[PDB]
């Protein structure tokens, strides 16, 4: 229509004819099927006059297209110095990025448009911005033999590394104004010192709520680990900065992060007596059963350090979880799949055991509830768990005669030659109880045919003794 005539006359260089369409009401910000606009094509083709005109007639300088390319991208790709200056003066997004993360500075650094690089930096371009492949403009200029550009961008970078050192000091001291100026002048909020402390670690350790929130506003990694696995939430919870604990959680902080010693935020809060932080972490899902390398839970540290209020609080949080484990054992025996998943979501231990050592996986394999077996293996249930007499779930599957469950357990590393205290292996129970299909599977998986219970009976002997000829034959041909 009236607009399609414009986008075409914009790439043709018909300066005088552009005035005709605009006077007759042709919209200035029309778009095609790929997203291009009269300003894109005038900047791509290098028609400065047509650009300037469209800017007096109000053209969206930062207009994006189907993949987020502004007119400045196109002027940077082609290398039109003048059009770059005219687009920036009208408020062009000097740091605009496409869907790949490519900014105008990347393009000028890759195609060797030195003058445009100077221009873009003059207007506050981000020299450190990485694209999809984690490559800065300097990286591109290096990989394309543009050494004069590589030199300039490298000078820029080392200055910005001084700002990074200052930002770390400003965040520890509490100079909120210094921090904000540093960020405004390109300092990296995710920089780290020698031991991996980022500015968020230091603001969190020292208790600077304002500086914590500013760092988070500018993309700081809330979960950054230092060289020993300590996150900002560890330091907040150690020093007892309740409000920083709250802000860190609200921004994605991991409530159960563990350092190299297995210490979690709830350990420090519990050992050092920060009741409100204990409540906040529990409210946010902290694991009360987590142990450090000394087998100590937060509860143990609490009583060990004479913090009785927190001690009782964690006892009740733990007693509540014992009842879910109890429910998981009965849910796993009865075959109620949906009930199993809910109890796991709410914190049921898939490796709890009753008085005689049966685990939810034992009961599920005994009763032939395959669906629950898969759920329990997919959530970390020990596949080679012994009860108080040495029976694994693979014992209970061969005895009962569940072919499917046997193949699953073996598919997940289940011990095939496990023996109870008597010497009975899964192959004895399969041959004993006439489950030929399970015998087959066991043989393929290295089942020992020479194993003997305390009575000196091989699986072959038990097939013979119990009148299972087909099985005795199979066990005969193997040896």
Numbering used by the authors: 13 to 491
Task: Quote what the paper states about this structure.
D12_H15_D12_H15_D12, the construct with the longest shared helices, crystallized in space group P21 and the structure was refined at 2.4 Å resolution. Indeed, in the majority of the D12-containing structures analyzed in this study, the D12 paratope-paratope interaction provided the largest crystal contact, with a total of around 1700 Å2 of solvent-accessible surface buried in the interface. Similarly, in D12_H15_D12_H15_D12, the N-terminal DARPin interacts with the C-terminal DARPin of one symmetry-related molecule, the middle DARPin with the C-terminal DARPin of a second one, and the C-terminal DARPin with the middle DARPin of a third symmetry-related molecule. The rmsd for the comparison between design and crystal structure of DDD constructs with H06, H12 and H15 ranges from 1.5 to 4.2 Å. Considering the elongated shape of the DDD molecules, which amplifies the effect of small deviations in the connector, they agree remarkably well with the designs. The structures of these DDD fusions are very extended in one direction (>110 Å from N- to C-terminus), and thus amplify the effects of small deviations in the inter-domain angles, making the agreement with the designs even more remarkable.
In this paper, we present a strategy to fuse specific, high-affinity protein binders to obtain multivalent or multispecific scaffolds of predetermined geometry. DARPins are used as building blocks to confer the desired specificity to the construct. A series of rigid connector modules replacing the DARPin capping repeats allow to combine the individual DARPin domains in such a way that their distance and angle can be altered to test different geometries, bringing the binding partners of the DARPins into a defined spatial arrangement. The two helices are not just joined end-to-end, but instead the two domains are made to overlap in such a way that the joining helix is stabilized by contacts with the domain cores along its entire length.
